[PDB]
Structure 1
Amino acid sequence: ACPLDQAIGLLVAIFHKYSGREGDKHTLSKKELKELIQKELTIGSKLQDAEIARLMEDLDRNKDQEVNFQEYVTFLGALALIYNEALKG
């Protein structure tokens, strides 16, 4: 695969690495998502618990306490905007 497809593939793999641990196999519970963030996000392990909780809360748009793939994509987009904004100085 080309660079772009590879990166997207890696992001999709990360989701499933954590979504299948408990409950529904295709959605992330509060526990799975927190673990994903602390282990896969560079600054994840240093964020306040309250902030991680707020982050997960906002990503759960339909309030079923799960973050499905579409809600995860929203998170990826937020991360991308953050990096892009920093580079534009």
Structure 2
Amino acid sequence: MSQLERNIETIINTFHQYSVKLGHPDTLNQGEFKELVRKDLQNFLKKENKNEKVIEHIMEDLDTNADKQLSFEEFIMLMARLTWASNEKMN
């Protein structure tokens, strides 16, 4: 596996570590998403993590089928946005 593939597998496995703990094993509910953001994005979303309202805005905006759950397909949009934002910050 290449560097890129290993990075994608890290995303997949991180998502699954939370999506499996409750309900549908392949989607994140609002509580598991908040826990993921709080622990595994504690630096990239440091400011947002202090305002639960902002985190809920992020969830709702990613939940494109409006079922109050995040699929991986919905979730990966956040991954791409935060990668872009990291690059901007480092520059």
TM-score by length of 1: 0.88
Identity of aligned residues (%): 32
Kindly tell me the number of residue pairs found equivalent between the two proteins. Answer: 88
Structure with the largest fraction of strand: 2
Displacement of 1:8 in angstroms is: 0.9
Q: Secondary structure at the match of 1:62?
A: coil
Q: 1:69 aligns with which of 60, 68, 72?
A: 72
Moved over 6 A (4+): none
Structure 1 unaligned regions, length at least 5: none
Displacement of 1:47 in angstroms is: 2.8
**CA distance, structure 1, for counterparts of residue 23 and residue 75 of structure 2:** 17
Aligned residue in 2 for 1:18: 18
Q: Secondary structure at the match of 2:8?
A: helix
**CA distance, structure 2, for counterparts of residue 14 and residue 73 of structure 1:** 11
CA offsets 1:44-64 (integer angstroms, 9 cap, x no match) = 464311111111111111110
TM-score by length of 2: 0.87
Structure 2 unaligned regions, length at least 5: none
